[PDB]
Structure formats: structure tokens, C-alpha cells
Amino acid sequence: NSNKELMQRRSQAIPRGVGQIHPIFADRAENCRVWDVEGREYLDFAGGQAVLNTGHLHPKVVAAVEAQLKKLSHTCFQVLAYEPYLELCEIMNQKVPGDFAKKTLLVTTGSEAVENAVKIARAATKRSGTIAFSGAYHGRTHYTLALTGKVNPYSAGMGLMPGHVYRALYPCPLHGISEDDAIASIHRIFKNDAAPEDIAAIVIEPVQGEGGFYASSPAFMQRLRALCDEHGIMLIADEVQSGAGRTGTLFAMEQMGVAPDLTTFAKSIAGGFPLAGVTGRAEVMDAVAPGGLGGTYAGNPIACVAALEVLKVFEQENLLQKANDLGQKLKDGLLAIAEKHPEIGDVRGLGAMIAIELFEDGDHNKPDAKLTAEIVARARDKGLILLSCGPYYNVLRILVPLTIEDAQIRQGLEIISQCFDEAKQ
Amino acid sequence: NSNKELMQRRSQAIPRGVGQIHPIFADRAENCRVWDVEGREYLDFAGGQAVLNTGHLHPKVVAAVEAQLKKLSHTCFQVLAYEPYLELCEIMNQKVPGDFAKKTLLVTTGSEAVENAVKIARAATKRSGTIAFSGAYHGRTHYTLALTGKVNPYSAGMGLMPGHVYRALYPCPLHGISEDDAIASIHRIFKNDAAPEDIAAIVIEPVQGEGGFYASSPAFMQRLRALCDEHGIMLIADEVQSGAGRTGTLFAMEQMGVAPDLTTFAKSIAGGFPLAGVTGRAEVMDAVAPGGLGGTYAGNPIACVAALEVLKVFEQENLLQKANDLGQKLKDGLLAIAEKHPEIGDVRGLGAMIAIELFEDGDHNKPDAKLTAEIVARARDKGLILLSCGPYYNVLRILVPLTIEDAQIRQGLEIISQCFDEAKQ
Amino acid sequence: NSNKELMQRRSQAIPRGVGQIHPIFADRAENCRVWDVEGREYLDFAGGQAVLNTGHLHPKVVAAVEAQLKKLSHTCFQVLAYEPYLELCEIMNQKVPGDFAKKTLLVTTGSEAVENAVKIARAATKRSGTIAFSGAYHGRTHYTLALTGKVNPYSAGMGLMPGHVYRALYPCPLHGISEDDAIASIHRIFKNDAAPEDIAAIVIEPVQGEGGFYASSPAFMQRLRALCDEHGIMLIADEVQSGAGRTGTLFAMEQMGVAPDLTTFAKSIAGGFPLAGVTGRAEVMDAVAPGGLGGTYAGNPIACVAALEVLKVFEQENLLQKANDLGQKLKDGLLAIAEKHPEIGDVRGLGAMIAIELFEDGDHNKPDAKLTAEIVARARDKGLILLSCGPYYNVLRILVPLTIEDAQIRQGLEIISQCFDEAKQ
Amino acid sequence: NSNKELMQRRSQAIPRGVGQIHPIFADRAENCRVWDVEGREYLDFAGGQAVLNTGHLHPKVVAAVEAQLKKLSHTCFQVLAYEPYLELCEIMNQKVPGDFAKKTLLVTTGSEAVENAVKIARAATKRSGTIAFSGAYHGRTHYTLALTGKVNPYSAGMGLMPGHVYRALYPCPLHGISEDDAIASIHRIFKNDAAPEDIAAIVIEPVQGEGGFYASSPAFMQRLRALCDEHGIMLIADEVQSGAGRTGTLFAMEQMGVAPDLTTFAKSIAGGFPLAGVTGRAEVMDAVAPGGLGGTYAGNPIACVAALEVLKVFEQENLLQKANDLGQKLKDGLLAIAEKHPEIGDVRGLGAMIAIELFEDGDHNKPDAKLTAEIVARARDKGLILLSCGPYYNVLRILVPLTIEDAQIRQGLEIISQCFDEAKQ
Ligand SMILES: Cc1ncc(COP(=O)(O)O)c(CN)c1O
Ligand SMILES: Cc1ncc(COP(=O)(O)O)c(CN)c1O
Ligand SMILES: Cc1ncc(COP(=O)(O)O)c(CN)c1O
Ligand SMILES: Cc1ncc(COP(=O)(O)O)c(CN)c1O
């Protein structure tokens, strides 16, 4: 029952392919606190990878889950239905941006959600190709690995992933890719490899997660929407990570000024329970013939009641406003730290989807991956759990539960401050 | 709060692609009993589609789940580990057949397990192709739909699924496909479309589920194993449905006299909680580099403890012996009904994976899909939940919990018997 | 000079990937005779691989070529047209079977012809998949290698060829594949891997060439034509080898009682000059937008006049009739030899597309690849050029020019007769 | 017998997909002169699309062709060899750039050459993927259409072409793509879609043909070579159009300062006869096992002696030097015309591979496709045959025979001048 001991057993029974960011075995948790098997307490700034916007075991969520456990945990919706699945669908049809009739499909994981959105876009348009962006992340199934703009390590050593997935450039001025370059990269696909008539959908993260927490501007998103409309291409917004309130609105697309045809959600939607889904223009969703959509565990009963509670908690605890306030506080603190450390070349984020990006001597073409990894390690040593990301591994992101305590905001920022001070020594 | 009312709401909020076998909304359940929103009771012979071998809400399983709910529900193993994931892996490494050391990856859905078994086989052999069988069912992601030997409705209207998946014939003498034809169909692939050096794996269900409950014979499975050994090809046993004790042994491969290189499992492994996995040769599992395997919800903590308890219950309540006793009582009972109804052309099954196949006037060339569906509808009217399957929709399968009580076995057979009799006028 | 000296230079300047059936360098040839650089004379029973139905350098063909050579050899039709191309197309439109308007595309090689026929079927049906048959041979480009039903050596060591080509079984009672098995295999594809709505074409050789000189029966071709009509699938007859008179009619489909949608031709169409083409249902051919069809050397002027001259020669010289007479004499002569040599298990062929298949001890399950190779070697030492074929390399085919004299037919059979006698001594 | 009547017959016998740049039917030609069926004479600045660098029917080439026509026209090299094939291979092994042992394969068309070079590279590296550049042109087979950086019209309406072909950006400063952008676009592929370990080759035209006569700089080519060397990727130089002396040297790579691993050649290699081939590092070429390379008409006897004669003519008549002189006279004359017409935004070219690009009011952002088309039509009315190209159809290219007479160069330039003036009036 020591972390080391458990890691030894892990090497024996579990594949090295399953990475381990922190060699620690968590035992119990509560809101933003996690205790490992040795009793040490940590402040969780990773949030189970953006899955815990309402924190570990939110009391209301757990209470709803415990009540559902008295009724049933599974029937397989496609065989025998149940109300929690229906209710969530009804609520998502209203909450997802788009001033038009929508329908919702529930599945189990974010990769399944993206898979289903594409199968739906293909059926609706009678086309087979898709376009995804550089640095994108959409899942670990063969097809979402192809959609994912990163081979190593997600699909490394496995041979080539499915074809007919084309690569566009994600707008990112910080790294010299203008919105014009991004829109131009799409037309390039049209002229060089796949005409519009063969593209069923363009998949994009309103705010890239693993890609580096880079956000699309409303203007860029508006150009994209116009491009899709012109060519009858479905716009799929993958909000698995940006969704469930992380950016200050339930869905980031609300802040773009345009609505997508399809939206994928997961992670924080059920606050720590396995659930995912796709909500979209009704006519598009209905394109698949009966029997064409499913999944054994899809819209698991317990996960659904959990999601329903999460939605009510956002409303009751005013978490969207808190997300925004937390974001301002984190960025202000991060900018203060930045004044003493030029390596921090950018502080950014919508709502609580905050990140800082490190550069050697603030040199924007020199991603500082060693410092980023060093800060993560030093933070773990000070009891703070962090995650990094970015195609060059030089981005630190903050995904702490929105339910965080005032004291914990100070605590996390203080610990980060120390890490940069002690790394520079 | 009426089934019809909820069905109307379903039709407006959920896409038609999500099918519905029984237009009923379950409210609560216990072991083999299910109650709908109207208070009507049903005997569940579908088991959430082979997910409830230990019954709805087995008390031991629920108690384990409730204890974990007091600790944590999610951290994302790849970020912070936890003991329930590690303990289940160790047990699965022991329980899945094979005299070599195994390693286990836990994910969430059956589709993901198959996806990962193939990725792992590709990384291990450094090959990209795979072979799957006619009538096979492996999931609803783009790649598993390609593996699935059934286009309609699973991938209907969507265009061609991922290439480089070759089709072999599942052995099935009842319908003229000999074991020699089956093996010859694999050599044909080697000769005509993809040499052995390009085939990473051959995926097979030891007992096809959706395909019609057709079982491979040990002899066949041994020829398959030998063919794979000869070519360095990974044998992937998809036991998502056949697994977790349905055939009288924990895994069907135990009755085949050979061990596969990789085994996928899900559905009944956690008795009603979202979990799936892949267990196989340790050096094959480790072929994928760190960071190449995962998934946000993978090995969800609550589902892991649920699974550990399910395995304990199989042992304490002697469910494997019960599966075999249940299977015999069911087959004896159906063979009885078959005496008065020639349409019942075959009664079969390993352990409790039982099925009957209907033919118009016992003519094996005339699948009776109409009678099949009628029996399903009549049974529901009598309070019995059934599922059919098979490429010709003329197979009735029984997936009732292995924890069913003796009187319920009689009750169910009695209802089935009544359905056939009444179907005669 | 010396054949061996040239072979030595060959090994140093040319990749070993280019096979050499006969280690002999030809210097001159005429009709059915070939003389090597050592002055040795050979009776050519291979016909440049079915390219010389009108014999080496037919005087009429040569005179037409010389006349054209004084005018121009190339302009690239797509840039500046020329009459010989136009004229050939008009004649092929009327001569290729099909009681409906047709258009003809001229390219250069047989592989290009097949490539374009599939491209045209895809544009006409707006579908991307194709079906080809076991043991088929369609060319050496990436896509035709996928269509080709034989991986080694055509595409050995190169990794997997293009996907979305599905495999059906070619009817062959001799080796246990009935017509019902063949058609069932097509429906199997529709059920398991690609719905009819995703198949642009079914490609078939009315008489397989490399596959072993196995011919389709009119009854089978008719079931196949009806299956295509029912699903809107284009039937492509690849007559690159069976065409230009080899079977007794200009095209083998003529003897099938049904017409294909598209026909590819090459080899013998130009009597020894580079030319290939696609003739088919006009509205299908016109489905491709201008600029979509071409090739720099396409419908080479010199090869076009040679082809026009070849058609006239078939008429003026009664070659179709002669092909039938030649085929009968060859089969009668081969059957006489078969009375003394049990290894000859089958003597078959339409028109002059004649082959015999060798089996060890006359057992249809024991192909005798060694004996076949031995006969080719012995025949060569006796001044007779032969080619073998078949997936088991135990089929000897006869592709001698249709212009052969009676004495040479007798002579060819005697030589063959002696090779069998001396192979058994 | 008028161009009009022949164009009408054409509309009825030939598919519309076969485009027709000039609605004229040629009857005969000599060097750079062409006469149509109406007896009108034209000055050919298109060279049969870069195929006639030694002019129409060069008397030395014709005499070589006539000598061979008396011996044999076809045997199928892979069946029975002949010396003309072997001798050209030996010469190309020496002529193709690269200070190391090489081997040569002869096929028939440029697309078949690219096809085989890729197959060879895949076999040599044991990798399945390839990278090609934007605006590239490599042929009309399925795979070369995927390699081709232009969907319309080459593969328009045919569905998606073969996957696993990735797109890099060709360096073109005139349009804003720096060499750094080009090289970075390759690393982007490695990072986002296909690791170097899965890329067998990078295919590039030293000077893009259809692409717009845009040439790679030695610096860029050297960077590409260093990149390929680092990753074990084969650099395939497609010189089908740039080769056979068009750029001032036999092969353009000679001017790049580095040698490709494989080179494709066709068009002008045989002065108007169907031939093409691939020459490469011996060890790379030998990677394919015997029987893996071929083609019925491959290295046709008559085209081989024509290519041999073409190479002698280049040496004897110093056509490489003339290419350079012609190039200079063309640019000087075109530059002169550019002063009176600002629409000519660029005059460029290595050797005799000359082009000018038209912009709407010198605005490089406004490709003048309409003026380009007008000039072609006016030139034709004036007796001069020209061809345009470029992704935006605003590039006029000159592929006039290198054997052109001085007065004709002036004649041609004068006509182009009048076209621009009159188009402006
Ligand atoms: C944008 C995005 N899309 C899809 C997924 C896949 O979700 P899951 O891991 O739940 O399958 C993730 C998870 N990291 C994600 O961030
Ligand atoms: C053999 C088999 N494989 C894979 C799957 C897919 O599992 P899931 O629905 O959990 O994704 C199923 C589900 N019916 C199955 O029976
Ligand atoms: C039926 C068939 N189709 C296509 C081809 C390819 O023709 P080519 O070699 O002229 O490219 C051949 C050549 N053996 C053939 O026999
Ligand atoms: C660079 C290049 N590569 C390949 C080809 C194809 O050659 P072919 O038309 O002879 O098949 C062309 C033809 N314009 C070409 O320009």
C-alpha cells in the first residue's frame, strides 16, 4: 500500500502503453483535494483531465447517484428505455447552442461521441471525407486517432491510421498561423485532395485541449460556419473538453456567434461518471436509419442522473460566473509570476480554461519543454497536481474544479510561483 | 409517467437512429425482475443485452459500488492511478486463459476494447491489416463497424467503412459452411488480397452473439491457432458477449483447448457498470509505447470495484455451474416446445448462451424472421423481455441473469411455450 | 551475340523485379517465328503474351504503320486530335457487344484501361467501391494490383494495396467453386462489407487469363448481369486478354448472351503496338467531366492505324473462324497426348484461348507446378515458346498467333508431345 | 474532312471527359510544323505536351524506328527479352543524376513510371505512405491521382482517391510559400498524420509542369535530400516532363546539386513514341522480388530504339545548349512584350521550360485565367499552338521543340505579341 509498491505491481500487470503522468495511487478525494494511499494530500489542478468541473464527489451528484443505485444501473437503452436518458437529451437539446430544433444521442466516451457525430454527418450529407485541424485531439479509436492532429504517442508504432481525413491549419497567431492561413488551408484541401462534395464534415475544438488551449476567435468561427454553409458541410464542434462550462458558458460555441450542426460532449458533463453525447440539428441527427446508432452502455442510468445533477449544480452554485471569476484570478496571478520569469511567454484562456506557455528566454520559436516538465515535477513535490500539453509539450494548463475554495486559488498560484522561483535558482 | 408518453417524448428528443426493441421505460429492477414506469413487472431474459449475468443490482456488487462512491469516482488512471484498476488487471491476467504472463488494459466500452486489441496487435507485429468473420459483431466505431460483418443497419447510409479489413467465413455447418471452408477462406485472403506478413490479427468471437449464437468448435479454433502461429498473426478472441461466464466457463476460449493472444471483455464483466478491457500476452500488450493507450474514463473506479465483486460472486455463488444447469434446463425446455412446433429448427448453446433458430416449415433455407419477431412481441405482452439476432433475424437468444431462480426458469419457458402455441391461429 | 552475355548485362542494369520467363533475346520475328541473337529459330506459342493474334509484324499492319509514320507519330490527342483515334473509337463502339449507344476512350496500357473503366463507373454511379474475383488479374498499378486476385509476386513486399476492393469467388467447378457459390459470395459482400449502394462496379474477366484460362458460363454471366442491373452496379468486362479474337468472337462477352456496361481491351487489339481502351455504355462513359480522362500517349497514332488494320485483317482473313479451327485442332492434339499422360487432368478453352492443367497422378487436389515448369523448359530447348499460368502454376496456355499454318500447328503439338514423353523417361 | 465535321463525329464516339484544347484534327507534321485536315499549317509551341523535344518525326529517330520495324515490334520483355530495352537501361543508369550504381526499369506511360517508383520505394523501405506537393501532377491512375495536387478535373466526381498520400506545400515565393514553409509543411505531416517511419517516399517535380512551371531551388532540394536521408525516406524525382532535356540539362536534378533515389522519365525520352521508365539507386531498385515488376508493352522495341536515337541526337545536335539559347531568346522576347502589357506578371524558366503568368492588373493576387484563355484562342487563330496550366489557369507555357528554327522563334514571339496587343485593343 505504498505508491512505489503499487507502481511495481503496475509494471507487472499493466501495459507501459498506459502512461502515468504522476506515479501516485489516489485513495480518496473531495472537491479539489486528493489523498494518495500513503495519506499525503494534494491540490488537484488537473481535475481528472477536465472531467471534474463540479469537483470530486460533489455531494449533490453523489446523492442523486446513490438514489439511482436503489432503482437500476443498466438495461441498455436501445433494448429497454429509461427516463434519465430522455430527460438529459431533452435538456441538452435546449442548452446546446443553435436556435433551431435539435435532437441528442447519448453514448459513453468522448471518442464514441466524435465517432458518432462523423457517422451522422456522413449519413446526412452522403459524403465520406472529413477535415480536422493541426494539433487537434479527438480520441483514441482508429478513426479519432486519424482525426487527432498528433501521431506521437497516440497512434505511434501502429502503422497508418484510416485515410480520407484531411489536415487543415488551426488558427494560432502566437505561432504565425493567421486566420487567413487557416481558412486558406481548407480551400487547399478542396483544390488538392478532396472537393467539398466529398467532405461530410469539418471537426474543430472551439478551444483546443491537448493542442495547447488555443481558442478560435468568433470571427474565425464565423468564417468557418459560412464556408460549411456554402458547401453543405456539417460543422462539428468537439466540446468534449471545452464543454460543460469550462469557458464561462456551458458550451464555448455560445461565445462564437455561430452554431455548429453537431456538438460532442463528455468529461465534465457527468462530473466523474462515464457518459458522453452528441446533440445537433434535428434533421442532421435523424439522417441515420433506426438501428444505426447505439452502444451497450450508452447513456448509462447512473451517469445520466449524475449529469442531470451537474447541470442543476451549475445553475444553483452559479458555476459559469465562478468559472469566469476563477479565470480572471488565475490569469492575474499567473501574469504576476510572469513579471519575474520571462520564460512564461503567454497567459491565456476563456473562462477557467487557463494555460501559460513557456519559451526559452521568452523566445517564441524555442518551446521550453524541459522547464514545463520541471515545473510539473516540482509542483507534485509541493503537493500540486498539474498537466501539460501542446504539440511541443511547453504548455501548462489549469483544469481545477470550478468548485475550488478561495484559499485553494491562493494555494495553487503560490505553489506555482515557488516552482518557477526554485527552478530559476 | 406512462410508457407511451415517454415514447412520444423520446421521438421528439432522440434521433430515430437509436433503435428501441421494447417501447417500455424501466423504472427499477432486481435480479431478473424489471418494473416499468407504470408498475408492470417483467421477467428479464435479455439481461441488458448480456450485461447482467449477476442480475440487476446484485446486492454484493451494489455494496462494493457504494463503498467506492465514498472514496472517489474518477481521476483518469493515466493521470493518477488507483487500486481498483490495478487489482482487476491482476485478476484478469490470472483468469483469462493462457500459460504465459498477461497484461490488461482497461477501457470503457466493448468497441474500445476491440479497437485497442487491434492497435496493440498492429504495434506488436508491425502490420496494418486484420481479418474478421462473416456475421461478426465488434462494435459501432468506424473501425469496429468495418470488422463487424453486417452493414445494415450498423453502418448503413454512411459510405464505405475503413479499408484493409478482410472477410473470412465463420464455420457454420447448420448453414453449409464447413470448418474447411472457413479455414480455406483465410488462405484465400492470403493468396488474393493481403499476404500474412500484412495481417496483424485475426479477430473472432468464440461464440458469435449478434451473428446468431454460433459456436466455434475446439477443433476449428485449434486450426486457427496453428494458422496464426505459423504466420506471426495475433489471434484476438472477442469475448465481450461470450465472456464473463455466459458459456459455462469464465471465458469461452477455455473450452477451445487453445489460448488467444488477446481477449476483449466487457458487458457482464461489471454486472451493470460501464467497463471494458483487453487482456493478452504481456510482450504483445507492451508493444505500444507509453502514451499510446488510454481514454478519459478508462477503468472507471466504481466500475472496477463492481467488476472485482462480480468475479467474487461467480466464485461464492457458483455461477458457472449454475450457467451450465440453466443452459440444460433451458435447452430441455425449448426442445420440448420444439416437438409441437417444427419451425424451431435448432436448439443450441454453450452453458447459458442459449438460442433457438426459426425456419418456415422447418426448411433450413427459409429463415422465419416474421415468426421470430412475433414471438418477441407476444412474449413482451406476457411480461417476458426477449431479444432476437442473426443475419436473417430468425434467432431467439436467451441472456437471462445466471442468478435466475428455479421458478422463474419454468415461468419463462412456460411463457415462450404459450407464445408459440398462440402464434398458431 | 549470345543470350547468356545479354542475360549477364541484364542482371547488372535491370532490377531483378522484372522477371524473365525465357532467358532469350529476340532479334527478329515474323508471324509465328522468332529468331534470337544466336540465330536460333523458335515457334512462338506465347504470342508476346496474347498480344500477337495477327502474328509478329503482319504485313498489312506493318504497311499501315509505315504510312502513318510518314505523317506524324504523336500530338497528344487531348491537345490536337487526329483521325486514326476517332476512327478506331467509332469502330469499337459498333463492334463491342451491347445493343445500345457506346463511346470509346483510348489509353495506352491494359492497366490504364482497367483504371479508367473503374474511374468512369465511379463517376457514373457516384460510388467508390468495386468487387473483383478470386484469381483475377487486372494490372500492375496500385489500384489494379488491389483488383488483381494474387498478391505474390505482383504486389509482394510493398505493404497493403488500396482498400475498398472486395473479393468474390470466380466460378470454377473443376476446383469446387459452383456458380451458386460465386453469386452467393457477391451477396456476402453486400451483407458483410459493402452495401450495393456503395459498389460502383463488379470487374470480371469473361475468361480468366493469369488465373488459369477458366471461362465463365453464359448462365453465370447472365445471373451476374441481372444482379448488377438490380443494384445499378456497372459490369466491367476486362477483355484485355480474352478480347481481340482469342475466343472465337471479337470479344468473349458476345458468347455470354449479355452485354457489359464497360469493356477494357488492349494486347492484341493493335497487333504488337502500344494501345489500350475502354468501350462502354455512352451515358456512363460521359459521366466524367471534360479534362477528367486522358494520358499523354493515349491512342498513339501509329498504334491506332495498326489496330484499325488488325480489325480489317480479322475480316479479310477469316481469323475468328480460324481461331475456332485452331482451338479444336489444339485440343484434339492435346487430348491425344493426354491418353498417354495422366498428369494432363484437363484440356479446355473457348476458341483459341486453349490451356491444359497438370496434376500429380491426375489428382485435382495435387497441382503439379514442377511438371509444368519442366514442360516449359523442355519445350524451349526444342524451339517452342510456352507460357504457364494459374494460382498453382500448373496450367499451360497456348497463345500462338491465329495466323499459324497447319504444319506449324502439327509441329507445335509434336514438340509438346515429346516434352511429355521425355519428362517421364 | 473539316475540323468541324470531325469534332462532331468526336462528340458522338468519344467521351466528353477526354478534353480537347484545340478543336483541330492534325494530319501530318514535321519538326515544329503541323498541318491539319484542312491543309492549314500551324507552329507547334506545345510539343505534344512536352513530348517532342527533338521535334515531330526527327529524321534520325524515324530511320531508327523503320530499321527496328523490319525486325520486331513486340515480344513482351518479361517473356522474351531484346537488346534495345537492355541498351537504353544501361545508358539511363549512366545519364540519370547520382554518383553511384543504378538500375533501370522501362514501362510505357509516365503514370506507370510514378506508379512503379512508389512501389519500388515501398518495397525498399517497408513503408506504405507517401508525400506529394500542392499543385503537383503525377498521372491519371487512382494512385497517381491521389499523388496529384489537383482534384478538378483529373479526379473530379469520382469519389475520394486512395488514402495514405499526404500533402506538403511546394516552395513558391511568387505566391507566398517560402522554402521554410515548404519544409515545415513536411514536418507538420510527420507530427500530425504520418510519422517518418511510415513514409516510403516524398515525390516531387524538380520543376512543376501542370503546376505552373515553378522550379525548386538547389537550396530547397538540398534541404529535402537532407530530410529524406535523416529519415530513410526515398526521394522520388518525377522528371517525366522536366526530363529528356527540357531544363538545359538532360535531367533537372543535375542542376539541384543532389541526386534523387529514384527518377521517373517519359514524354520526350522517345521523341513521340510510347515509352517511360524508372532509374534509381541499384539497391533500392532491387528491393522488389522477381515478378513484382512488369507490364505487357513495357519498353516497347520501337520506342526503345527511338529513345536511343533521341539521346544520340541530343549529343550530336547539341540540343541541351540549344535548349538554353532558346530559353533565353524566349524570355527576352516575352520580357519585351511584358513592358507593353502589365498583365504579364512573371517570366520564368530553367532552360527551354519557359512560362509567363497572367495577373489581373499586375495584381499577383488576381490570377487572370480569362486573359490566359483568350491568348490561347487568339494564338490558335494566328496559327500558333499554345498550352496553359497552373492551379489558377493563368500560366502560359512554351514546350516548343528544341529543334526549332530561329526564324520560327521570332515568328512565334511575334504572334504572341499580337495576341496581347489585339486582346487589349
Ligand atoms: C477535445 C476532445 N475530444 C475527444 C476526447 C476523447 O474523450 P474520451 O477520452 O472520453 O474518450 C478528449 C479527451 N482527452 C478530448 O479532449
Ligand atoms: C462480441 C461483441 N463485441 C463488441 C461489442 C461492442 O461493445 P460496446 O457496445 O460496449 O461498445 C458487443 C456489443 N453487443 C459485442 O457483443
Ligand atoms: C485481363 C488483363 N487485364 C489487364 C492487364 C494489364 O495490361 P497491361 O499489361 O497491358 O498493362 C492484363 C495483362 N496480362 C490482363 O491479362
Ligand atoms: C510530372 C508528370 N508526371 C507524370 C505524368 C503522366 O504521364 P503520362 O501522361 O504519360 O501517363 C505527366 C504528364 N503531363 C507529368 O507532367
mmCIF file of N, CA, C and O in Angstrom, chain C residues 98-125:
data_model
loop_
_atom_site.group_PDB
_atom_site.id
_atom_site.type_symbol
_atom_site.label_atom_id
_atom_site.label_comp_id
_atom_site.label_asym_id
_atom_site.label_seq_id
_atom_site.Cartn_x
_atom_site.Cartn_y
_atom_site.Cartn_z
ATOM 1 N N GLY C 98 -23.198 -4.958 -77.089
ATOM 2 C CA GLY C 98 -24.033 -4.022 -76.366
ATOM 3 C C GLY C 98 -24.987 -3.373 -77.362
ATOM 4 O O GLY C 98 -24.582 -2.538 -78.191
ATOM 5 N N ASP C 99 -26.253 -3.760 -77.312
ATOM 6 C CA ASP C 99 -27.226 -3.184 -78.227
ATOM 7 C C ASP C 99 -27.726 -1.825 -77.707
ATOM 8 O O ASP C 99 -28.884 -1.674 -77.325
ATOM 9 N N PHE C 100 -26.818 -0.857 -77.691
ATOM 10 C CA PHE C 100 -27.080 0.497 -77.227
ATOM 11 C C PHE C 100 -25.895 1.354 -77.625
ATOM 12 O O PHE C 100 -24.844 0.819 -77.998
ATOM 13 N N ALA C 101 -26.059 2.666 -77.554
ATOM 14 C CA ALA C 101 -25.008 3.591 -77.914
ATOM 15 C C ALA C 101 -23.792 3.471 -76.969
ATOM 16 O O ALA C 101 -23.947 3.401 -75.744
ATOM 17 N N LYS C 102 -22.591 3.473 -77.544
ATOM 18 C CA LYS C 102 -21.397 3.393 -76.729
ATOM 19 C C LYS C 102 -20.402 4.470 -77.130
ATOM 20 O O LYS C 102 -20.514 5.066 -78.196
ATOM 21 N N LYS C 103 -19.452 4.732 -76.245
ATOM 22 C CA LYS C 103 -18.368 5.649 -76.545
ATOM 23 C C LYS C 103 -17.066 4.911 -76.175
ATOM 24 O O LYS C 103 -17.068 3.987 -75.342
ATOM 25 N N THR C 104 -15.969 5.304 -76.806
ATOM 26 C CA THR C 104 -14.707 4.651 -76.550
ATOM 27 C C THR C 104 -13.633 5.634 -76.146
ATOM 28 O O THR C 104 -13.496 6.700 -76.734
ATOM 29 N N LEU C 105 -12.900 5.261 -75.110
ATOM 30 C CA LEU C 105 -11.774 6.018 -74.601
ATOM 31 C C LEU C 105 -10.510 5.202 -74.990
ATOM 32 O O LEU C 105 -10.463 3.986 -74.766
ATOM 33 N N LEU C 106 -9.518 5.840 -75.593
ATOM 34 C CA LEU C 106 -8.304 5.108 -75.900
ATOM 35 C C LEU C 106 -7.242 5.575 -74.916
ATOM 36 O O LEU C 106 -7.128 6.776 -74.656
ATOM 37 N N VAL C 107 -6.496 4.628 -74.347
ATOM 38 C CA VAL C 107 -5.383 4.984 -73.480
ATOM 39 C C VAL C 107 -4.137 4.240 -74.047
ATOM 40 O O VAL C 107 -3.977 4.171 -75.265
ATOM 41 N N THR C 108 -3.272 3.687 -73.211
ATOM 42 C CA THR C 108 -2.093 3.019 -73.760
ATOM 43 C C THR C 108 -1.896 1.592 -73.255
ATOM 44 O O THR C 108 -1.605 0.706 -74.056
ATOM 45 N N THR C 109 -2.070 1.363 -71.953
ATOM 46 C CA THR C 109 -1.859 0.037 -71.423
ATOM 47 C C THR C 109 -3.126 -0.587 -70.883
ATOM 48 O O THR C 109 -4.093 0.109 -70.607
ATOM 49 N N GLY C 110 -3.104 -1.909 -70.746
ATOM 50 C CA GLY C 110 -4.239 -2.638 -70.211
ATOM 51 C C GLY C 110 -4.582 -2.214 -68.793
ATOM 52 O O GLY C 110 -5.765 -2.157 -68.424
ATOM 53 N N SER C 111 -3.559 -1.916 -67.995
ATOM 54 C CA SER C 111 -3.781 -1.490 -66.620
ATOM 55 C C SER C 111 -4.485 -0.139 -66.617
ATOM 56 O O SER C 111 -5.358 0.110 -65.782
ATOM 57 N N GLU C 112 -4.099 0.731 -67.542
ATOM 58 C CA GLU C 112 -4.719 2.049 -67.633
ATOM 59 C C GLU C 112 -6.191 1.847 -68.052
ATOM 60 O O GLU C 112 -7.081 2.490 -67.509
ATOM 61 N N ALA C 113 -6.438 0.936 -68.988
ATOM 62 C CA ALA C 113 -7.806 0.688 -69.422
ATOM 63 C C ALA C 113 -8.659 0.304 -68.209
ATOM 64 O O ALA C 113 -9.736 0.860 -67.997
ATOM 65 N N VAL C 114 -8.177 -0.629 -67.400
ATOM 66 C CA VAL C 114 -8.956 -1.037 -66.235
ATOM 67 C C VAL C 114 -9.099 0.140 -65.251
ATOM 68 O O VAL C 114 -10.188 0.401 -64.739
ATOM 69 N N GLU C 115 -8.019 0.865 -65.019
ATOM 70 C CA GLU C 115 -8.069 2.021 -64.131
ATOM 71 C C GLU C 115 -9.200 2.972 -64.519
ATOM 72 O O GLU C 115 -10.015 3.374 -63.680
ATOM 73 N N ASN C 116 -9.236 3.316 -65.800
ATOM 74 C CA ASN C 116 -10.228 4.234 -66.314
ATOM 75 C C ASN C 116 -11.626 3.696 -66.321
ATOM 76 O O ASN C 116 -12.567 4.453 -66.060
ATOM 77 N N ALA C 117 -11.780 2.408 -66.574
ATOM 78 C CA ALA C 117 -13.118 1.834 -66.554
ATOM 79 C C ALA C 117 -13.693 1.985 -65.121
ATOM 80 O O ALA C 117 -14.864 2.351 -64.957
ATOM 81 N N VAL C 118 -12.881 1.735 -64.098
ATOM 82 C CA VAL C 118 -13.370 1.869 -62.713
ATOM 83 C C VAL C 118 -13.646 3.342 -62.396
ATOM 84 O O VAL C 118 -14.671 3.657 -61.789
ATOM 85 N N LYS C 119 -12.745 4.233 -62.818
ATOM 86 C CA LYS C 119 -12.912 5.681 -62.610
ATOM 87 C C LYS C 119 -14.244 6.140 -63.247
ATOM 88 O O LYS C 119 -15.002 6.901 -62.660
ATOM 89 N N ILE C 120 -14.494 5.679 -64.467
ATOM 90 C CA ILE C 120 -15.713 6.020 -65.165
ATOM 91 C C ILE C 120 -16.944 5.425 -64.429
ATOM 92 O O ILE C 120 -17.961 6.107 -64.309
ATOM 93 N N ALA C 121 -16.855 4.186 -63.932
ATOM 94 C CA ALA C 121 -18.015 3.612 -63.243
ATOM 95 C C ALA C 121 -18.300 4.379 -61.956
ATOM 96 O O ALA C 121 -19.451 4.573 -61.581
ATOM 97 N N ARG C 122 -17.246 4.822 -61.289
ATOM 98 C CA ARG C 122 -17.405 5.558 -60.056
ATOM 99 C C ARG C 122 -18.085 6.892 -60.342
ATOM 100 O O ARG C 122 -19.009 7.275 -59.637
ATOM 101 N N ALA C 123 -17.663 7.582 -61.391
ATOM 102 C CA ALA C 123 -18.273 8.865 -61.713
ATOM 103 C C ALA C 123 -19.754 8.695 -62.145
ATOM 104 O O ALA C 123 -20.596 9.528 -61.831
ATOM 105 N N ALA C 124 -20.052 7.600 -62.831
ATOM 106 C CA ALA C 124 -21.400 7.341 -63.308
ATOM 107 C C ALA C 124 -22.367 6.971 -62.175
ATOM 108 O O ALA C 124 -23.505 7.427 -62.166
ATOM 109 N N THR C 125 -21.916 6.144 -61.236
ATOM 110 C CA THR C 125 -22.772 5.711 -60.149
ATOM 111 C C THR C 125 -22.622 6.561 -58.907
ATOM 112 O O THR C 125 -23.468 6.486 -58.016
#
